[PDB]
Ligand binder design. Structure first.
Ligand code: V0I
Ligand code: V0I
Ligand code: V0I
Ligand code: V0I
Lengths: 261, 261, 261, 261
């Protein structure tokens, strides 16, 4: 149906995009970057993340496909050489949609902003020490002191979460995972020191203790927030949908990205 | 209805057990340790684990309650001082049952044994180096070399799993978590180096590479298995049921066991 | 001889400082904050670090003493209640000096700045991804990608180094320790993934790969450096000297700060 | 002078050994496996460790050389293809000896055994839970509960130590490093949770708390010790000497074994 293609913008990805557009022109496929139903991202995982955020208001109407023109990017299902086969399979249709969970971040001030993450949302201080009270379902759980906190989706667990020692979670699990960045632990300061995995409908709230200014990232996007009263995390009701044309199981995707390929 | 009480066996737990039996005698409660419907464990988490295994064939007919006579044992909901209040609340009934997921381990030979775990199942070598191929849903994922592997239930994630760097998982999540014990990683040997969290219906199979003898633990119970062809892990269809008389959320239980109490 | 006293500046530390100055006035002790031979820091480890940096040009002429007015600060040897005993012991003299190793950081541009650290020197990016080549004694060792790097002195190993998973090193060992902050490791990116401990006379050089702007911290002090060609680390030839009046072994100091007190 | 050659015993290593013996026969080199001055190990690091232990009573009279016939074994300096060049260089002599530190383990009973380690000494329980008091220079430092403890030499820090999260230490540093295996940490049980690095002349003593039977390994060799009163660790006064014919710096050796080669 209606589709669009985003490109990383180097010569290789732009040319692949032009060639796929020409192939789509041989079928009943209209290029429409306002209301696409298929969004193809040609590049790396950053390109894919940007495509997701370009269309985060129409996630229920869109299925995503990623082509990696660099290394195997984690959200990519296709190598450039297979682009023509993808054009054909997509043109016919009847593919199967797979959905991954997303993370909702709410930032309250003294007003309210919400963000959606496909990989993770992180919070750090705007310069001074980072100290927050971590409140789970209204239960005061710990006072965190350290460099920051990372809350990850299942598909994000192989990203920043992994570098911070988090568990890799299969994306059929509707959960979010909280990991610590360089927590201090001594006689007077104590944190849990393990990643925490939360189900859908649990709410994790971070509440400032002294400083109220924080640097909050959502996927690639980092923003300074001033005068914050609360940062709230929960599994979103929204999901991202992928078009799948063949089996590529998550654990094989993990194997291919981290073990050998 | 029918109940029984297991005790750690020290003077404090035996006397509490005798006093609770006397209190139950004032209600319509028959002591029956063949077909109980309520199993009370008085001791620590080891006592509770032994009670679970004493009745693992009647898990669908039983609700468990733990009293800790030492430190706050993780599966315990009651301190000894509250025993009389428990007798009363239990006598009336109408309490709410909560269920935690369990782990099924299958060991195949050259014959087949199955075990059920509430905390975890671990595998180590019987003396020589431990090397196994890890196969996930028939996908060859890694060759593990190291000291051993631990597969944990959600409620077990605060136990051995935690010491091995695993994530703590809320027990409403029907999953199991695989953690590494001292994996070797160099130019020639590679493992994933993160805990892995698996949903229900995924099967993780360990397949021997050289040595076929393994020491397999299920909760406290360690057994030498010889001539092993495969060890298979999956989330069990069986669940353990707890009798709950008041709110004691898992994350508060974690707070009280690890942060402060 | 000549001494001075720095204070954290709260009411408790200022009053202790005034009372110690009055006690010193009863001996042959001149207050001199230009050329002291004894520097007393009253506060926490931050106060002590600031005192060290206030006098880093006269380290060979100075012995430091720390009083902690908060929790046991790691560099502190005295509680406030013992201040009068310290005045007396110090007045007589004949105490023993103990020396800890220090870290030299050199930052080269396209010009050169040097810094001395008692705890550690860290490097992060000024916004974009952090990528540096790590060169040890002119040997290209790894390309580091992640959040940053921390180089610690022995006495700093219980500070930020510890939170990053580094080893605690006894300060009689003339060494520095490099730890990673959230390194990425996948099929294409590889780091050593262990802390590294370097002897005196080894030089660790960080060399930019793309971005040349870095945020470099030395103890509490964080500075944006632009147009960096190289950051070089080595154990300094300079040492910090403490006045010791009684045994307080490093491993007891560690026990008291992290295990119980 | 007098030399001997140990072989892993596969066809490749036995033939290399025979060919080197024939080459040595063309010089003033006597084969003597009672009092060698050069010990050549042909195989892997296990072969090298066995050669070290075969001659641990004559370490001051011996220089070791390792040839790896498998992967780059860490203690190996030569590939098989260079064997003839080694014969020649060794025949002439005038090579430089390099020394690495060693670890002394003393096991006291209710009698005394001492062992020397090139990689590490580990202690685990003989079946039950492992609990020991850790005493550093007669200072009670922690009660360790977990799977076991590993004490490593500098050259051993890239071995089991590395898998347990220890730091890699340059072998010019006369030290030993203690790492934890799966320590338990909760409200009631506390360990330091970081590797500890000890200088020469510090003594680390492990003292049993309940069970007195332990499985103690020294390099590859694992032994059940019963009725143990104390296990004591210290940097040995003895050193192992390597014959070096060219530069192969430790950090390049680490790079080649863990980063790429
Ligand atoms: C620009 N990034 C796009 C992405 C991605 C991604 N998504 C997954 C995925 N879901 N699964 C597996 N691989 C995944 N990638 C891979 O991550 C590498 C990213 N490049 S980078 O980190 O060097 N960089 C900052 C340039 C690259 O290989 C890419 O294919 C943002 C993301 O970086 C992540 N990030 C930030 N700081 C990090 C840290 N210190 N360690 C590890 N990740 C870190 C964070 O998650 C953010 O959303
Ligand atoms: C006899 N154990 C009973 C239990 C339990 C338990 N269950 C949870 C829970 N679900 N949540 C939180 N606390 C939990 N406990 C607490 O664990 C301490 C156990 N005593 S012990 O490990 O010292 N020991 C071996 C005497 C004690 O406080 C108890 O209340 C067996 C279990 O030990 C575990 N175990 C074995 N080796 C371990 C390692 N190296 N590190 C950590 N745990 C280890 C393994 O899980 C096994 O099933
Ligand atoms: C203001 N700091 C002074 C100090 C110190 C110190 N020196 C040692 C020592 N040698 N041994 C043991 N305790 C030590 N302290 C203790 O560290 C706590 C510091 N307060 S703080 O980190 O919360 N903060 C930023 C307000 C406090 O208890 C103090 O007594 C700077 C230092 O923070 C360190 N730092 C920065 N980020 C950190 C992270 N994420 N985790 C851990 N440390 C971190 C870094 O080393 C810097 O030099
Ligand atoms: C038979 N080993 C000989 C050796 C060695 C060695 N010495 C160093 C060195 N100094 N530097 C870098 N590489 C090093 N090797 C490499 O270690 C691999 C060993 N094979 S093995 O561990 O699979 N095995 C048990 C068959 C192999 O590549 C070899 O070249 C005993 C040693 O294994 C170590 N060991 C035991 N359990 C371990 C764990 N869980 N993780 C990691 N190491 C473990 C322990 O140190 C013991 O002394």
């Amino acid at each position: 149906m209606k589709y669009m293609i985003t490109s990383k913008g180097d010569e290789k990805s732009d040319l692949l995009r032009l060639n796929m557009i020409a192939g789509f022109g041989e079928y009943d496929m209209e290029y429409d970057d306002v209301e696409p139903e298929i969004v193809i991202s040609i590049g790396g995982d950053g390109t894919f993340l940007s495509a997701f955020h370009q269309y985060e208001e129409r996630l229920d109407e869109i299925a995503f496909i990623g082509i990696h023109t660099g290394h195997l990017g984690f959200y990519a299902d296709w190598r450039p050489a297979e682009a023509d086969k993808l054009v054909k399979l997509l043109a016919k249709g009847e593919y199967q949609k797979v959905s991954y969970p997303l993370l909702k971040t709410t930032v309250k001030y003294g007003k309210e902003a919400t963000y959606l993450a496909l990989n993770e949302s992180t919070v750090k201080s705007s310069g001074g020490p980072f100290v927050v009270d971590v409140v789970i379902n209204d239960i005061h759980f710990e006072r965190f002191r350290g460099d920051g906190l990372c809350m990850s989706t299942p598909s994000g667990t192989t990203a920043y979460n992994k570098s911070l020692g988090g568990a890799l979670m299969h994306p059929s699990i509707e959960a979010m995972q909280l990991t610590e960045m360089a927590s201090i632990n001594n006689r007077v300061y104590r944190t849990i020191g393990s990643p925490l995995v939360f189900p859908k409908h649990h709410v994790v709230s971070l509440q400032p203790v002294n400083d109220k200014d924080f640097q909050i990232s959502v996927d690639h996007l980092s923003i300074l927030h001033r005068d914050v009263q609360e940062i709230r995390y929960e599994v979103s009701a929204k999901k991202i949908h992928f078009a799948r044309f063949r089996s590529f199981p998550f654990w094989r995707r993990v194997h291919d990205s981290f073990i050998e390929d």
